[PDB]
Symmetry: C2
Subunit: 307 residues, 2 copies
């Protein structure tokens, strides 16, 4: 038979790890070794926030209030493991999406924190010139949507539109011509859900629906590009965090419904088994996942600390 690999690499002490950032710390987690490390303390990181990692290994956080009423913007300094304050998001905003192409970061839509109104406004931070600006607005006003980046394109999915219904709409942003396009919609309109790239499909997991909590897993093949169904999540949950770690799709946490019965956070980890098509329970409880945004990243081991 054939082999997975032809020649071995020389290791450099770099590990693909799940980075869990909440308001106490950014903790690195290795699901295969069931072990955690400290990457950075995070006492200044706002409890309600979104997170993104470049490409380069640059972690950015957007969220909270303020530092004209605004939102914080941080970059993790990988050399010092200190969080850097950056030009703040001009808008105080929640329940938005975060994208990124060629080092530039995109905050899409919201949920104005002052006004309570839905936004279509898209802000792009340029890290060379160190400044934010308004690019083309999203075709809808929305919050509760999710955003992911792939091959220099930005995708916006689901959300709640300006009535208060969930939307199934899917939009693509080309930075090099600056327009949004509707793509084929998802089967299940949803907000507050998990998203990741997984070979090379946009996978979406659970959420709130017109029927409330969902365990539905869909995938947009990037590609046909059609929507197809994957094995449903073991439990109906909102705000599952999906991450692609090396070859594999992980699911971290999410909410509810548990027991008077209310949406309540579960701090567990699951892994999709591609062969078999099953969700496998990895870790029952990880306290570091509580309140945490979740990211796959390539970390230098000798920059981590023992917990």
């Amino acid at each position: 038979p054939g082999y997975l690999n032809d020649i071995p690499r020389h290791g450099m002490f770099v590990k693909d790890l799940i980075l869990l950032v909440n308001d106490t710390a950014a903790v690195a987690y290795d699901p295969m070794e069931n072990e955690c490390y400290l990457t950075a303390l995070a006492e200044q990181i706002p409890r309600n926030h979104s997170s993104i990692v470049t490409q380069q290994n640059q972690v950015y956080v957007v969220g909270g209030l303020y530092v004209p009423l605004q939102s914080y913007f941080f970059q993790l300094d990988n050399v010092s493991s200190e969080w850097v304050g950056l030009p703040p998001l001009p808008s105080a905003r929640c329940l938005f999406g975060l994208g990124e192409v060629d080092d530039k970061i995109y905050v899409v839509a919201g949920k104005d924190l002052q006004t309570e109104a839905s936004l279509d406004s898209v802000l792009c931070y340029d890290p060379v010139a160190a400044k934010w600006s308004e690019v083309k607005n999203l075709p809808i006003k929305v919050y509760g949507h999710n955003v992911i980046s792939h091959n220099g394109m930005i995708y916006c999915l689901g959300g709640k539109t300006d009535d208060k219904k969930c939307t199934n709409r899917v939009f693509i942003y080309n930075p090099k011509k600056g327009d949004w396009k509707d793509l084929a919609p998802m089967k299940t309109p949803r907000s507050m859900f998990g998203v990741a790239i997984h070979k090379g499909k946009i996978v979406i997991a659970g959420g709130v629906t017109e029927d409330g909590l969902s365990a539905s897993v869909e995938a947009f093949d990037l590609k046909t590009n059609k929507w197809e169904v994957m094995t449903e999540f073991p439990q109906e949950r909102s705000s599952i965090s999906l991450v692609s770690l090396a070859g594999s799709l992980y699911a971290i946490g999410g909410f509810a419904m548990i027991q008077e019965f209310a949406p309540t956070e579960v701090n567990d980890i699951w892994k999709y088994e591609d062969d078999k098509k099953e969700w496998a329970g990895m870790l029952k409880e990880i306290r570091y996942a509580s309140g945490a945004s979740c990211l796959a990243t390539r970390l230098n081991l000798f920059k981590l600390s023992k917990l």
Copy 2:
């Protein structure tokens, strides 16, 4: 559903790795990350040698000649990554087996390097008093057999007996009463083969037989304790090195038959997939496996060097 793990551990920078020791270096290999590191240089390590790791993380090597005509005995100093010369094996000997219980190391049988004769003689090295002695002789004279240790017991398997036929005999050594016992024999008499503990069965892989090269995989359940058959190796090979790494059974290298057609070393890695019952090709070529004894060990990452 349930979960594999309940609580996460705090990582300590320790990794289960395949240690490949030959006459140039001891190279650590991570089959899951397809990466290698240097653990120690090994220019003094004899090309024909056997290897064993304690329990504690102590690597010993026996082989070659000499330093009354003897064999070298080395211990890897984990702190300095230097090989320590230890009291030499009183006997110059090859094609023996290596065992170990409670820090003591056992050299069983051979293949006298001076005399050419098969031995039944068993030598035990005591590391506290730093000295070798003769314990109870094996019930047969044999070479080409293999030896593994489990739960304070030592097992001796196969080999060529004093005629020149392969044997199917299996012996257990209890150090605390000092006797050898025949256990149930294997189905296929063999010499020059691979052995490992795998849940909690003594797995044996390939070898030379009365029919020459074998791809046969058997397992002694430790336990029924009966012999059962596993999925045959992809190729008939002698001297496959078997290692249990964390949950998983790996097979490294072995010989032949290739192409005038002669037994020739293949420097590849395979992994048994327990679910499915298949051998999966991991790595086509690893040059560090050439001439190498192979061991699963728990290494401190910050003690390794970049290659």
